[PDB]
């Protein structure tokens with residue numbers, strides 16, 4: 047076709063990568079994965095209720111928390127239904143199905159149609175009680191009204207999808223022939239060949255070192271110790287170059303996507319080393335065929351197809367099944383898990399440890415391991431454990447089958463929870479030995495089934511494609527698959543968004559180079575230009591798919607006085623049904639890898655829902671933060687907020703003679719009444735408690751004053767998590783914070799004691815999820831925070847969470863942390879100043 051070759055040029059512009067391209071490949075895997083993905087894409091498209099998918103109701107099925115019940119005066123929810131200019135407040139009960147509120151509106155008045163949210167693109171369709179809509183729970187949580195605009199449902203037509211048009215037999219020890227290396231531009235140098243499987247080295251060999259020149263030959267055959275028949279699927283040939291110090295590396299999947307052993311000549315362009323992480327595992331070769339080191343090799347020139355237990359041993363097994371994810375396994379622990387594998391199968395918590403005790407380098411062991419996977423009755427039975435599920439998905443498990451069972455346990459996640467783990471699940475795609483996987487397809491299905499998950503899946507993939515050459519290819523094939531089944535409706539919004547963001551980026555990069563108030567000239571000037579025959583009517587806010595941004599409030603926009611020059615943008619809600627005029631404040635920025643920030647903000651959301659299991663509310667503000675390309679993205683602006691440093695700075699800048707009372711005054715200054723003031727003190731006790739715990743666990747507690755904000759309503763929140771991570775006292779409980787809790791240097795108080803009891807109850811609450819937090823944190827550092835791995839960096843969280851210790855021993859560990867915070871005063875703060883704001 048041709049109207050199918052225009053559609054191709056378009057997708058490539060949204061992907062930010064040219065998929066169909068074949069200049070940096072050495073096989074049909076990616077092309078093969080595209081073909082393989084046509085069926086999962088089509089099956090989900092052909093199975094999604096057209097209407098329900100057009101309206102994407104945002105429903106949860108979790109019990110309404112205690113705090114939102116104590117927020118319902120009398121089983122009576124006040125929904126304000128607005129038509130044209132009319133308004134009608136109605137009385138609804140926590141089980142009033144949305145559609146059933148029509149027989150409560152057409153019966154409750156007189157003298158087909160769906161409810162939408164005012165200003166938002168957030169419908170209230172489907173067979174669900176109102177107490178199960180995030181929008182509703184968000185109205186009740188922050189003591190707000192419930193505005194609805196009765197209007198015509200969207201038409202599923204706009205969601206139109208464009209019409210789619212033997213190895214176990216040779217005891218031959220494995221061998222690889224090194225032809226040689228050749229860097230186009232420059233010591234001693236040797237090749238290192240490893241046969242790996244799930245971060246587990248099966249065999250190693252090297253080559254006699256030779257002088258480091260523009261071309262280095264060898265013509266050697268490296269005979270490994272692994273029989274051809276013993277090579278597990280997912281096994282990688284990892285080639286490295288030392289001088290001893292590492293310089294280059296590349297990977298080749300010994301068994302391919304067709305289950306055939308690799309044969310023939312290979313010229314691979316090797317990735318460099320800068321100056322552990324997920325990039326080091328890629329099957330992708332360097333696209334930069336010029337600068338980059340190369341390697342020539344050759345492959346051979348074969349397809350792949352109950353008793354009792356003592357008591358001391360039982361207690362030895364249990365001691366191991368209990369140990370946290372990061373606690374290592376002795377060869378003794380492993381032989382133990384393996385010998386009692388059948389007793390280890392009855393315990394789902396044993397799976398990551400038992401499957402890590404398997405010598406994958408042996409055909410017969412894997413054979414029994416699969417016979418073990420056949421007796422999954424217990425695993426399949428057990429309730430879904432995300433902490434356990436994520437574990438079988440990390441860098442430690444390269445076997446297709448083990449991983450698949452974990453993905454199989456994910457199928458039962460409702461849309462609400464997919465959104466909580468989407469970002470990490472997408473980052474987990476980097477651990478997949480193959481381009482096509484149960485996980486890659488799962489994200490595709492979940493992405494196509496619901497518009498919200500799909501909108502977020504897009505940016506997550508888009509972000510990775512634009513700043514990772516190690517994984518862009520695999521991701522590009524996944525995004526393309528998604529874009530060919532999301533519909534023309536969404537295919538259109540992603541176009542508006544890409545257009546809008548790309549114009550703004552250009553403005554950031556240029557205003558960045560031209561550096562005063564003279565700069566304000568261009569900023570205002572360029573912003574008005576783009577506001578014409580460019581910037582389309584309105585785009586969806588990327589970090590909040592519900593919001594639409596209209597015209598650019600030029601007057602409010604500016605450049606910030608930071609090291610780099612991020613823009614401070616403001617837009618009118620492009621939707622008239624809006625209950626206000628409050629603009630949409632977005633911070634635009636180039637110069638930082640915003641992915642680190644996304645990961646942290648996402649862990650913050652996981653913590654809130656962990657605290658929702660225990661009917662708690664630590665009042666955090668995990669504001670929206672979307673990376674949109676190479677070292678660039680946007681950041682939501684919290685309305686009515688200032689830096690804690692700015693509240694101090696009022697009375698001195700060049701000094702910082704930190705007055706232990708300015709904060710409490712500021713709150714009263716901003717509080718309309720004195721009564722609301724107490725609620726702003728209330729919200730402070732909680733938000734300050736939340737970030738104290740969370741920040742401490744994540745080990746980002748040592749914050750530099752500037753990087754802490756407060757709402758004119760009591761909510762406290764840290765910001766700029768990208769800082770403390772991009773360069774590398776417990777948390778932050780300064781005398782001015784404590785002065786809002788009625789205390790000084792050394793004393794107690796009613797409000798303070800409460801603070802200290804919200805913390806311990808939140809700290810221990812997180813410990814009931816040790817394994818989960820450890821996996822996320824460990825999985826976070828590996829895939830998004832290079833130069834923050836080493837191993838010793840991963841093990842920080844083991845101590846923060848106080849592993850081993852009973853609840854009672856931990857409570858007195860956190861309380862002491864709260865103490866190391868008082869015996870410090872402003873030493874810390876004043877010290878940041880002597881530095882950040884100086885040297």
Ligand SMILES: COc1ncc(-c2cc3c(C)nc(N)nc3n(N3CCCC3)c2=O)cc1F
Nearest residue numbers: 633635643669681682683684685687765766768
């Ligand atoms: C990753 O990098 C970032 N992370 C965070 C910010 C940042 C968020 C921010 C928010 C969410 N709300 C409000 N009301 N001000 C903000 N703000 N202010 C502007 C100036 C100093 C405070 C911010 O700087 C900016 C970054 F660049």
